[PDB]
């Protein structure tokens, strides 16, 4: 799927509303990392059962 | 050049594009572009209001 996209994306046109949408995917990905890492470390359960 | 690829874009350009689209969508159905009143948006917000009202009842039920 990557090779397909690498070959087609450089020669097509996209309207501003989609370009603005692909940008926000990055920020939506960064935000959940910390809340999830602490869950995996059991921090929320440890404190609630201090 | 020519706007190829996925380059970044300004918020002024986003509404700019979205305006040309609404005007063209009106041309296909009403065959005119004077647009004294814009029924396209008014009809769309009524759907968004219905979807939002449905989700609010779910939060109420979930909270219960």
Find the residue in B nearest to A19 (Cα). B6
Nearest to B19 by CA among A19, A33, A24, A16: A16
B interface with A, Cβ–Cβ < 8 A, is: 2-9, 11, 13-14, 16-18
> Which member of A10, A14, A16 has the closest CB to residue B14?
A16
Q: Do B18 and A17 touch (CB under 8 A)?
A: yes
Q: Do A20 and B14 touch (CB under 8 A)?
A: yes
Cα A44 from Cα A37, distance rounded (Å): 11
**Taking the CB of residue A5, how many other CB atoms lie within 10 A of it?**
9
Residue A39 CB contacts under 8 Å (≥ 6 apart), including other chains: none
Measured N-to-C along each axis, helices B39-63 and B11-30 cross at an angle, to the nearest 10 degrees, of 110
Cα B16 from Cα B22, distance rounded (Å): 10
């Amino acid at each position: 799927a990557g090779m397909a996209a690498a070959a087609h994306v450089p020669h097509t046109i996209y309207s501003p509303l989609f370009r603005k949408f692909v940008e926000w995917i990055e920020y939506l990905c960064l935000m959940p990392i910390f809340p999830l890492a602490l869950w995996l470390m059991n921090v929320y359960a440890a404190i609630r059962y201090r | 050049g020519s706007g190829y690829g996925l380059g970044l874009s300004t918020r002024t350009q986003v509404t700019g594009y979205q305006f040309l689209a609404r005007r063209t969508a009106m041309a296909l159905t009403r065959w005119r572009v004077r647009m004294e009143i814009e029924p396209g948006r008014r009809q769309t917000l009524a759907v968004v209001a219905s979807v939002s009202a449905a989700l609010v009842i779910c939060l109420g039920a979930l909270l219960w």
